[PDB]
Subunit: 361 residues, 2 copies
C-alpha cells in the first residue's frame, strides 16, 4: 500500500526519480533505485508502460504502472516473483506509488527493456517479401519452448503467446517471453475463463469457450508462431471464430466426432472438409522437419500435442545441437543446454537428447 | 452450366429466390472475381437479359444437409436486405462436387469502406448519413428478428450502400440462425469489435439482442471515427467495454456465463465524455440504450427505429445532400411491427404514403 518517491532536478538538469523498491527475486531487501529519461512507450490495457534509464548503470528498463486493487493480491506480480529463467523477461524490482491524485495506488513493475520483438522482425521481413533465415526460426522457437517447459513445470500457463510477446536481443539472439498479465496457474478441477488468448493464436478448444483447458494451449499458440515465421503470415486468420475454424479445418482436416466433443462441451453441431496435405501449405524449399514439428504442435486433441520439452528435443532443432553452429554474425549462440532439474521434471530421460555430447565435456 | 459466345456468356437454369420453385434459363456475362470469402468466391456479372449487375456467391455444397444460408435467404423480402434473385447448382471444380451459387443484388459500397475514407481524411461521416444508415439497419434487424432469426455477424463490412440513393442493405447471411428457446447455440459467431459481452464469455443461451449490441457498436464507431471496443483479445475487448460501461454487477456477470464467479473495480465512465464534444446528445443516448450489459435491457430494433435521434428522418422537408428524396423509410409491414405495433404511430409519420 505505501512508500514514497522523490524528484530531484540534476546539474544538467534532467528529472531524476528515486524510489525505494523491492527486489524481484531475492528476499525483501529494499533498494534505492534512481532513474531518468522517462518516456511513454506503450500503453497497456490496465495502465501504462514507460521506458527509463537507471542513473548509475545507465541500463535502460521498462516500468509497467498498473492500477492496484487494494482489496486483493496481484496475480501478475505473484507469478513474476516465482520465475527465474534466461528466456523469461526479468522483474528487477517492484514498488507501489500513487498515481493519480487519488485514493488509488499504482503497482509499478521494473523490467529488462528489450526493443525488438518477434512481431517486428517477422513483419520487417514480410514487408520486404523475404523469408527469415531458418536459423533464427530455430533459435527463437527453441528458446520459447524452453520458457514454456519452465513455466509449465510450475503449472503456470501464459495464455497469451504471440509474437509481440517474444522479445529479442538483436546481437545475442536471445528471446525473452514477456507479458504475464493473462497467466494463471491451472488447477485441474478449477475452471478458467475462455476469452484469454489473442486472435490468431487461440487453440480450437478456446475458440469454443472450453473452461477445462490445459497448458497445451500455449503449445498450440507456439505452433501458430512457428508456422507464421515459415509462412510470413498468420496461418489461421479470421475476424471471427468461425472464420478461424474454417482455416484450421482447411489444414488439419475435419475433426473427428470425438475430437469435436473434446473441444465443444455441448458434441455438438456446422463446417466439414478433409485433411490437408500439410506440405502443400508452405513455400517449396521449407524444411520437412519444420513442417513435421508444426503438425505435432497443431493437433486438435490437446494431449496429442508435444510438450514444450518434447518440441525442444525435435529433429528441426538438431542444427542448434551442432557444436560448430554459430549465429550469422559469427558470435556463439546463446546458452541452450544449461537445463535445470526443474526444467526437465516433465520428463528427465529427455536430457539424453536435449544435451549434446559436446555440451557435457 | 452451359458456356457460350462476344465475349463470354454463361447460361444456367436457375431458380428464383422468391415465390414458386419454377426455374428459368438465365444468362450472364462480364464475369469477374471480386472477392474470396472464407466459404469461397464471390463474382460479379451482368445479366444479358436486363443489363443489371449482380453478385454471384459460390459455396461448396454438401448434399448431406440443406444449406442454411439459402433456407434463410429464401424467406426474406425487405428493402434493407440484399435480395436473392436466383440460385443454382454447378460443379466448377473438377470432381463429383457441387457448388451452390447465390445470385444477389450487386451493391457497390459498404459502410466499412465509407467509414474508412472519412477517417483517413480526418473527418466524420455527417450525422444525416449516420441516421439514414443506422435506421435502415435497425429496420432490417426488426424484420429478421420477427421471424426469430439472428444475423450473428453485424459489422460494417456487412452493410452495403448505394451512394446515390443512400439505401443500405444487410448482407452476409452465412452465420444466421433462427434461434429457438432451450436449444443451445455456438458462441464463436460474431466478429471481433462487435461481439457482445455474453458472447465474449461463450454464453450459448444468448438472444437476438446480440445483433443489437453489434449495431450499437457500429453506431458508436460512426460517431467516433474508430471502433469503440477494440482488442486482439476477449480480455482487451472487455477492459474497453468495462471502461465505458463501468464494472458489471455480480448477476450481470453470472448472466453472461454462469461458471464465472469469477474482475477489476472500474467506475462507470460518463458516456458524455466518450464522444467528440460536437456529438448530438440523442445519438449518445441511443448508444447508451443499445450498449447495455443486460440483454433484455437493450432496445429492440423497433424501439430503436422509434428513437428521438431518428426524428429528422421523419421530417417532411428532409432531403439527401445531393438534393434527392430520401429512400423508403416508412413502408412498414405488419410482420415488421409485430414486436410492438403501437409504435406505428411514431414510425409512420403523417405525410408518409
Amino acid at each position: 500500500a505505501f512508500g514514497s518517491m522523490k524528484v530531484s532536478i540534476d546539474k544538467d538538469g534532467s528529472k531524476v526519480t528515486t524510489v525505494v523498491a523491492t527486489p524481484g527475486q531475492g528476499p525483501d531487501r529494499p533498494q534505492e533505485v534512481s532513474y531518468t529519461d522517462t518516456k511513454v512507450i506503450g500503453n497497456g490495457s490496465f495502465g501504462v508502460v514507460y521506458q527509463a534509464k537507471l542513473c548509475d548503470s545507465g541500463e535502460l528498463v521498462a516500468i509497467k504502472k498498473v492500477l492496484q486493487d487494494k482489496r486483493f493480491k496481484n496475480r501478475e506480480l505473484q507469478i513474476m516473483r516465482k520465475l527465474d529463467h534466461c528466456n523469461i523477461v526479468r522483474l528487477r524490482y517492484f514498488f507501489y506509488s500513487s498515481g493519480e491524485k487519488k485514493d488509488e495506488v499504482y503497482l509499478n513493475l521494473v523490467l529488462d527493456y528489450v526493443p525488438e520483438t518477434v512481431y517486428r522482425v517477422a513483419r520487417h521481413y514480410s514487408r520486404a517479401k523475404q523469408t527469415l533465415p531458418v536459423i533464427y526460426v530455430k533459435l527463437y522457437m527453441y528458446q520459447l519452448f524452453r520458457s514454456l517447459a519452465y513455466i509449465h513445470s510450475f503449472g503456470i500457463c501464459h495464455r497469451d503467446i504471440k509474437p509481440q510477446n517474444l522479445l529479442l536481443d538483436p546481437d545475442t539472439a536471445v528471446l525473452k517471453l514477456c507479458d504475464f498479465g493473462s497467466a494463471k496457474q491451472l488447477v485441474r478441477g478449477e475452471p478458467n475463463v475462455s476469452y484469454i488468448c489473442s486472435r490468431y493464436y487461440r487453440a480450437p478448444e478456446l475458440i469454443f469457450g472450453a473452461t477445462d483447458y490445459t497448458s497445451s494451449i500455449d503449445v498450440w499458440s507456439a505452433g501458430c508462431v512457428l508456422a507464421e515465421l515459415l509462412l510470413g503470415q498468420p496461418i489461421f486468420p479470421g475476424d471471427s471464430g468461425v472464420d478461424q475454424l474454417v482455416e484450421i479445418i482447411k489444414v488439419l482436416g475435419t475433426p473427428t466426432r470425438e475430437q469435436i466433443r473434446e473441444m465443444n462441451p455441448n458434441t455438438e453441431f456446422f463446417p466439414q472438409i478433409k485433411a490437408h496435405p500439410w506440405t502443400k501449405v508452405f513455400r517449396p524449399r521449407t524444411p520437412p522437419e519444420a513442417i513435421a514439428l508444426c503438425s505435432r504442435l497443431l493437433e486438435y486433441t490437446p494431449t496429442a500435442r508435444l510438450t514444450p520439452l518434447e518440441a525442444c528435443a525435435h529433429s528441426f532443432f538438431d542444427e542448434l545441437r551442432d557444436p560448430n553452429v554459430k549465429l550469422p554474425n559469427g558470435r556463439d549462440t546463446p546458452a541452450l543446454f544449461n537445463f535445470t532439474t526443474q526444467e526437465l521434471s516433465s520428463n528427465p530421460p529427455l536430457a539424453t537428447i536435449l544435451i549434446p555430447p559436446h555440451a557435457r565435456i
